[PDB]
Amino acid sequence: QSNRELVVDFLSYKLSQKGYSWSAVKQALREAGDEFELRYRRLHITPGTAYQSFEQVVNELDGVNWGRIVAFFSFGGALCVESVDKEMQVLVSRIAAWMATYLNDHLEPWIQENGGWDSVPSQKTYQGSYGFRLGFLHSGTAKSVTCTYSPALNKMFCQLAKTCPVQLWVDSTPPPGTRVRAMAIYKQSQHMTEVVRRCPHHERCSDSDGLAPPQHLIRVEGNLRVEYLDDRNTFRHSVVVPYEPPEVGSDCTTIHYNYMCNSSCMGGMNRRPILTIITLEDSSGNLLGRNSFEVRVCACPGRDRRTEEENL
Ligand SMILES: [Zn+2]
């Protein structure tokens, strides 16, 4: 229980390589941890679903060898960095605690027996040089609310075709010509290759604003400069608007998104969970920053969020 020095130092080292401070046989793990990274690749994380993502990934890697321990320590390193990227700093100390309770029960008893000292759009969060973060109104879960967001799940519940305000926060103002793109993908791995689109009923219902194509799940409300993309090679849908600096006195910019199809719609999402990816891009289309959040479109956003959070 004092291998804590290994976890508390190895993770703080991977935070050093990215610019974060924590706030013998130590060298040995960093070289392997590093040497494993340049030769590798390397699953969503929320403050509530945090221990779940640790039970799953660590149990899924089937005889413990000297190679998986690096792969496990290195796994906890990316987790703490991505947790801070997602503006979820709280999980860093929690991850070290879980990294201290798995090796103590499952992984070490193998080491004392040895004792030797020698197609799919990515969803990784990047805040980028402009400090790009997402903000949400804290609207509670009373039965009458159009849209609500759950921080414990980083999940937004909204009613169909209702204003979903999403805030863009930046440390510095991106140059003119900057654009903001929204895109939905399926959350589960088995469906991530499938394009999220509207179901036949809502696709052919008289709801068009005259700007969005009838097959697009996500629309932007109140913006004549809105642009809709059906990708030439991935066939994925996205919607982009020009970024505007915050209003007079404000310090965030608010896009009004609409979700035009319900989560349980047969022929569409068919009760499958989706994520919405917001990217900041310049005029030439280079990526400046990316954040994502799960979305569910339902009839009563209030009751569904409270029902989900009461499970935590
Ligand atoms: Zn539908």
Residue numbers in the entry: 3 to 25, 45 to 63, 72 to 90, 93 to 149, 162 to 355
Study authors write:
The tumor suppressor p53 plays central roles in regulating cell-cycle arrest, DNA repair, and apoptosis in the response to cellular stress. BCL-2 and BCL-xL are anti-apoptotic members of BCL-2 family, which inhibit apoptosis by directly engaging the effector proteins BAK and BAX, or sequestering pro-apoptotic BH3-only members. P53 has been reported to directly interact with and antagonize BCL-2 and BCL-xL, thereby leading to effector activation and ultimately apoptosis. The DNA-binding domain of p53 mediates its interactions with BCL-xL and BCL-2 at a surface outside the hydrophobic groove for BH3 peptide binding.
Using this strategy, we determined the crystal structure of the fusion protein at a 2.5 Å resolution in the P 21 space group. In the structure, an asymmetric unit comprises two BCL-xL and two p53-DBD molecules. The two p53 molecules (molecules A and B) contact each other and form a groove. One BCL-xL molecule (molecule C) inserts deep into the groove, and interacts with both p53 molecules. However, the other BCL-xL molecule (molecule D) sits outside the groove, and interacts with the p53 molecules to a much lesser extent. The structure of BCL-xL/p53 complex shows that the two p53-DBD molecules dimerize through an interface of approximately 900 Å2. In our structure, the p53-DBD dimer covers an interface of approximately 1600 Å2 with BCL-xL-C. This BCL-xL binding interface comprises residues from the N-terminal loop, β1 and β10 of p53-A, and from the helix 2, β10 and loop3 of p53-B. Tyr22 and Asp156 of BCL-xL contact with Arg248 of p53-B through a hydrogen bond and a salt bridge contact, respectively. Most of the residues that were predicted to interact with p53 in the structural model indeed binds p53 in our structure. It is worth noting that a region of BCL-xL (amino acids 99-111) has poor electron density in BCL-xL-C, although this region has clear electron density in BCL-xL-D, suggesting that this region becomes flexible upon p53 binding. More importantly, although mutations at p53 dimer interface, such as Y107A and H178A, are not located at the p53/BCL-xL interfaces, they still disrupt the interaction, indicating that the formation of p53 dimer is important for the interaction between p53 and BCL-xL.
